[PDB]
Ligand SMILES: [Cu+2]
């Protein structure tokens with residue numbers, strides 16, 4: 381067999397009482413011969429279950445902390461009130477249980493969940509915490525898309541990790557990772573190195589998630605067969621997008637369709653990206669992350685000409701704007717790259733080049749390294765706003781994530797959004813230039829449980845590149 385079977389997260393629907401029980405517990409995985417790596421998982425030794433929720437239905441998620449240290453649980457992509465998201469203002473202490481009441485009110489999507497612990501988000505995600513949120517609505521159900529979970533509707537969580545000599549997860553929040561992020565030399569696909577999936581002939585639906593702390597990926601097929609993007613971060617697109625290459629940022633989700641009709645086996649590969657620290661082996665060349673082997677069986681699934689009603693971007697005439705300036709300390713930034721170059725070689729650079737030595741507060745937004753006690757502003761609920769997030773005077777990649785909403789990108793790093801990226805998204809690329817998004821917060825977030833907006837390169841977020849804001 382050699383290629384191990386791609387693990388499928390257990391589907392988890394709400395019980396009769398309308399509740400979902402999540403147990404954040406310790407475990408272990410086997411990735412290197414000899415030693416077993418100590419890991420953390422939700423309802424298991426690594427990653428988590430796929431919570432399937434129906435639009436309109438209420439649910440109370442009961443997160444119990446079976447870990448030696450405190451953790452939190454962000455429902456990434458959920459249009460919910462701040463009083464239900466749980467971040468640094470809703471800490472789940474060891475041995476205790478935290479409840480999150482959610483009333484699903486958003487299109488059918490592949491959303492996800494992960495810890496959002498103050499200054500430890502990168503560490504806890506690297507440790508193996510994470511999981512999926514499958515939202516179903518009426519409009520999507522009518523479509524002839526693959527629906528058989530784990531057979532033709534398959535989740536693909538792509539994460540990179542690095543192990544030490546003692547077979548432990550080598551996580552660091554040091555001078556290097558504060559600048560370029562935590563990258564590894566091992567490529568996990570649902571926690572498995574190069575898995576294999578047996579799919580029926582016809583159409584294969586892959587719910588992709590870039591669960592890397594800092595690594596951006598560029599998905600493609602081994603034989604050059606196109607990938608049909610049908611869904612983005614917060615819902616299906618208006619119509620599918622035919623692509624040969626699909627770049628995916630940290631915390632992004634792309635639902636794609638692949639033609640398995642010919643029955644030929646092929647690989648889902650990741651192409652080397654132009655990002656600092658990410659060009660080292662095994663990522664220096666095209667890397668197969670998932671082997672697809674078509675079975676003799678078939679499905680009646682088809683690629684629809686039109687998916688769902690995609691509203692037009694409203695012309696927000698005199699809406700409030702917000703300038704969010706991401707900032708990095710050059711003195712620390714330079715030391716990080718010098719240390720990266722020394723430890724990993726010149727290849728690390730990927731062909732590239734008000735202060736303090738406060739590495740834990742080196743990265744900021746609008747001059748401030750995340751102050752939980754001071755939200756930047758208050759937004760009126762149900763109003764449109766035009767937010768510009770800038771990354772000038774800094775060459776790093778910043779996938780900007782915004783809590784409690786799904787937005788439409790107006791400008792992505794200068795140029796307009798790509799075909800697939802013009803739908804509903806909660807993450808926007810900010811790399812060396814400025815981006816503009818059209819946001820609207822339909823749910824409140826008080827000072828006590830405020831929303832956040834941060835860079836999804838977890839190490840930048842843990843070193844201060846995060847801001848909070850209220851909605852009322
Ligand atoms: Cu997230």
Ligand SMILES: [Cu+2]
Nearest residue numbers: 778835837840
């Ligand atoms: Cu960043």
